[PDB]
Amino acid sequence: AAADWDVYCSQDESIPAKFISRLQALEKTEINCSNGLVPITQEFGINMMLIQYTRNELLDSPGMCVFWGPYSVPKNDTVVLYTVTARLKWSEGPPTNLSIQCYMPKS
Amino acid sequence: AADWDVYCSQDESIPAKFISRLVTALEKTEINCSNGLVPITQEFGINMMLIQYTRNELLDSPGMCVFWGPYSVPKNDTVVLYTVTARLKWSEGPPTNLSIQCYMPKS
Amino acid sequence: FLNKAFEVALKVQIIAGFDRGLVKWLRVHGRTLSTVQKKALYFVNRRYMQTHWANYMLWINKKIDALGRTPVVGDYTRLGAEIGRRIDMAYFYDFLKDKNMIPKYLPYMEEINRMRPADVPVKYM
Amino acid sequence: FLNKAFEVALKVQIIAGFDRGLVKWLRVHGRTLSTVQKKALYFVNRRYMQTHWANYMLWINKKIDALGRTPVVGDYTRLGAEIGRRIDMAYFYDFLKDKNMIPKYLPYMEEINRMRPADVPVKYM
Ligand SMILES: *[C@@H]1O[C@H](CO)[C@@H](O)[C@H](O)[C@H]1NC(C)=O
Ligand SMILES: *[C@@H]1O[C@H](CO)[C@@H](O)[C@H](O)[C@H]1NC(C)=O
Ligand SMILES: *[C@@H]1O[C@H](CO)[C@@H](O)[C@H](O)[C@H]1NC(C)=O
Ligand SMILES: *[C@@H]1O[C@H](CO)[C@@H](O)[C@H](O)[C@H]1NC(C)=O
């Protein structure tokens, strides 16, 4: 339930990925991105966030999250992997850690 | 070093096996593990490395690499993800990055 | 944490910026959308601010500290306006419309849409 | 970056430990293996040392720095022996046999197998 985020990956690095979530109280949500740790607040109901494949710290919009990667995967040269992880800290219970993976066709 | 793979176990008590086969310049290989940055030298021909799913700093063997994780995966409640990444530095050219992933069935 | 006047300045400008962008997008894409779909997108704006508030606050505090002086509300107005114009909400407007994912308009959304932008609740981290 | 006597002590003990482990494993699993498969596993020992020499050196240096005195060759003998017995190579022996992945025995492997353990080349990083 808490792990179920709706992940929409792109086919081109120029178009950011979209993630949507819907919502043992949840105290904190932090996305571990290549450009840093990005806090987000999951409000009751629907939440939306963009994740970029590319980084330009000078021109990027405030608070942007950028994927880690690209990574090569074994035995498969047609795609590369982009990923982030997220940590959800709860009032009661151990934190949960989730992995968000997006495969991109290789140019 | 185009030829490499990871062979995952079905039990957290049994480490995964990473095998690479190098033909031929590769200056450096670093594995980014939950317990640290682990250097390895990929010699001409076959190279092997164990990757543990569990960490005990007191009892683990010297130089052991431990996966990051476990991570929950969205929309898939039957498995969890363990992963490390590898960075390969070449004499000339940009470094290459590998994603080493193992899915473990859940209890 | 943050003085209320400052918070209000931020929220008013952020939501005003997002809304200007939505008006712009709707002039092109709004013809086939229902009234409730449009209201749902205005809610999307306010909710985007809520979701990303803590994350905007990091950037804001960074910007404020670089002033080399005590801030005034005008500083927060300017930064709020900058967030309001820089966030590209059209990535979501297009995606939601293209996939027929514009959310069904529900009471909690109407409630947030009926508030003054100054009163939209945000959570600091 | 390491005195040759120290390096030699390490390599001799590491390979001796790995080899003892392989003998123990072969008593159980060796019956159906060909001579060249067994030679290949003896090569796997030496190669594992080569591959992991750099991370062994981190561990070694950490241990040496904590000795509470300057080291002598015996310290490297001891640490080498600890590495030699603690690395669980049987995980690879079992995997390679079970999956029919025991490597094809090639000249570079024989060359490494014919060397003195003291002479197996290692790369510092
Ligand atoms: C982000 O996660 C990586 C593992 O993928 C970890 O090495 C790093 O410490 C994390 N970053 C922060 C800022 O906690
Ligand atoms: C490589 O993996 C991707 C997604 O993980 C998949 O679409 C593709 O088919 C794989 N490679 C081949 C040759 O099929
Ligand atoms: C390991 O990689 C993670 C990303 O997965 C990164 O956050 C971290 O800085 C890296 N750690 C080291 C020691 O380089
Ligand atoms: C979950 O992931 C595993 C490994 O990636 C796969 O074998 C399995 O089919 C997946 N299940 C679902 C429901 O996606």
From Swiss-Prot, chain A:
Return the protein name.
Vitelline envelope sperm lysin receptor
Q: Share the domain note from the entry.
A: VERL repeat 2 is important for species-specific lysin binding, even if it has lower affinity for lysin than VERL repeat 3. VERL repeats 3 to 22 have high sequence similarity, indicating they all can bind lysin equally well, but they do not play a role in species-specific sperm selection. VERL repeat 1 does not bind lysin.
Disulphide bonds annotated for this chain are: C9-C102, C33-C65
Q: Which residues form a coiled coil?
A: none
Q: What mutagenesis or variant effect is reported for N47A?
A: Reduces lysin binding
> In the UniProt record, which residues carry a glycan?
N32, N76, N97
The shown range, given as first to last of full length, is: 340 to 448 of 3722
Where in the cell? Answer: Cell membrane; Secreted, Extracellular space, Extracellular matrix
Consult the record and explain the modifications the protein receives after translation. Answer: N-glycosylated. About half of the glycoprotein mass corresponds to carbohydrate chains. N-glycosylation is not required for lysin binding. O-glycosylated. O-glycosylation is not required for lysin binding.
Which parts of the chain are VERL repeats? 38-107
User: Briefly, what is this protein's role?
Assistant: Structural component of the egg vitelline envelope; forms long filaments. Functions as a species-specific receptor for the sperm protein lysin; prevents fertilization by sperm from other species. Each VERL chain can bind multiple copies of the sperm protein lysin; this creates a 3 um hole in the egg vitelline envelope through which the sperm passes.
> Which domain of life does this protein belong to?
Eukaryota
The record's gene field reads VERL
Assembly: May form disulfide-linked homodimers. Interacts (via VERL repeats) with sperm lysin. Each VERL chain can bind numerous lysin molecules.
From Swiss-Prot, chains C, D:
Compartments where found: Cytoplasmic vesicle, Secretory vesicle, Acrosome lumen
Outcome of mutating F92S, per the record? Impaired VERL binding
**Tissue localization of expression:** Sperm (at protein level).
Gene Ontology cellular-component terms for this entry are: acrosomal lumen
Carries keyword Signal?
Answer: yes
User: One of this protein's GO BP terms?
Assistant: single fertilization
**Annotated keywords:** Cytoplasmic vesicle, Fertilization, Signal
Q: What does this protein do?
A: Creates a 3 um hole in the egg vitelline layer through which the sperm passes. Does not have enzyme activity. Species-specific interaction between the sperm protein lysin and the egg protein VERL exposes a basic surface on lysin that may dissociate the egg vitelline layer via electrostatic repulsion. Plays a role in ensuring species-specific fertilization.
The subunit structure is: Monomer. Homodimer. Molecules associate into dimers and then rapidly dissociate again. Interacts (as a monomer) with the egg vitelline layer protein VERL (via VERL repeats); each VERL chain can bind multiple copies of lysin.
Q: What name appears for this protein in its UniProt entry?
A: Egg-lysin
What taxonomic classification does the UniProt entry list for its organism? Eukaryota, Metazoa, Spiralia, Lophotrochozoa, Mollusca
